[PDB]
Structure formats: C-alpha cells, structure tokens
Amino acid sequence: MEIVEYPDPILRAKNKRIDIFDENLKNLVDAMFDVMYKTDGIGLSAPQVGLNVQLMVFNPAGEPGEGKEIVLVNPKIKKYSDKLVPFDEGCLSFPGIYAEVVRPQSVKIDARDITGERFSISLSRLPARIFQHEYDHLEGVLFFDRMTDQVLDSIREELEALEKKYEEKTGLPSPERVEA
C-alpha cells in the first residue's frame, strides 16, 4: 500500500460517493485502519492511500486498543463552531512539514457506517482538529490551502522540494505549484 504525497493529483481528484457496502469495503476499511496504526494516526482518508472515494477511518484515541474504531462513509460537516483555535498540523502527504493552521474548535458530522446506516457525531479538541484535516482530503483540500500567507511562506521551499521529487519520479510537470 502506499501514502500518496503532494503534489500527486490523486490528492486533488474528485472523490466518489460509495453505494456498495460489501466484503470489499469491509476489507479496504481494515487495510486503512492498519496504515493509520502503522503511521500512528487518529484519522485516515482513502485518497491518501490512493483511492478516490469518500471513506475515512478514524479512532479518536489514535492508538491500538484505545478509543473506538469509527468508519465514516460519505461524511459531511453539518456545523462548524464559531470558536477558532491555532494548532501545528502535519500531514502524511507532506513528510516532515509542520505549520500553524487555524480551525474551528468543534464540528458535527453526518456519515454512514460500514453497513451503510446513517449516523451523526460531534467532535472537539484534537479529534475535531484531525477530523477536519482528513475531511479536507475528501474535498480535494490540502492543509496549506488553509494557512495564512505568512505561514505558507515559511513552508514554500519544502513544498517546492516535494514538487521537484514528483517531477523527478514521474517525468511529468508538477500539476500544481505553490508559487501559484
């Protein structure tokens, strides 16, 4: 399996709704939880492992044997809080890059579970932070899109180094450029 890194176009592509809840989906969710634990995550979205579908696995505790394994199919953020807060975010698609993103402190979510039943849920603090980050992946949004101009400048070069790695690996021009 593999983590997709910026600027790979997968991370910007349209993510398709899921209509079929079968042994296949069950198996994908599990591979995903496993990459998330492998990488010490609290959340993980399908595009980041190379699949453009609206699926996120999430465990608020972010550790084996703690919290609860939540599957979020076709999720939507129904409400954001007015209260906002800063936090140094990372992202597996940008190895070793950390910078301040301001986000709402809490959210209310609607999604479907592994059998397709509709549920909602509310998150705050660190789970809400990560949820928002992962949910952005599902909307083709990456964390630097949410940074101020000042903060983006601090990570420009690091993003350009990733643009270059893409161009060297693929022989294609980087499809997006932070210069832009």
Side-chain-side CA neighbours of 172 within 13 Å: the count stands at: 9
| Residue located via tokens 């294609």 | 172
Binding of Zn ion by 1 (CB under 5 A): yes
Token code pair at residue 67: 């919290």
Q: Are 46 and 15 a contacting pair, CB within 8 Å?
A: yes
Binding of Zn ion by 48 (CB under 5 A): yes
Footprint of Zn ion on 73-92 (CB under 5 A): 91
Q: Are 10 and 17 a contacting pair, CB within 8 Å?
A: no
# binding residues, Zn ion (CB under 5 A) = 8
Minimum CB separation of residue 179 from Zn ion in Å reads: 5
CA neighbor of 152 nearest in space, from 106, 100, 110, 94: 100
Q: For 118-146, b where at least 16 C-beta lie within 10 A, e where not — what string?
A: eeebebeeebbbbbbbbbbbbbbebbbeb
134 catalytic? Reply is yes
Determine if residue 91 is labeled as part of a ligand binding site.
Answer: yes
Instruction: Give me the catalytic one of 5, 89, 134, 163.
Output: 134
Determine if residue 133 is labeled as part of a ligand binding site.
Answer: yes
Binder among 13, 16, 26, 34 for Zn ion (CB under 5 A):
34
* Nearest to Zn ion of 1, 84 (CB atom): 1
Minimum CB separation of residue 43 from Zn ion in Å reads: 6
Q: Which residues are catalytic?
A: 134
Q: Which residues bind Zn ion (CB under 5 A)?
A: 1-2, 30, 34, 40, 48, 91, 179
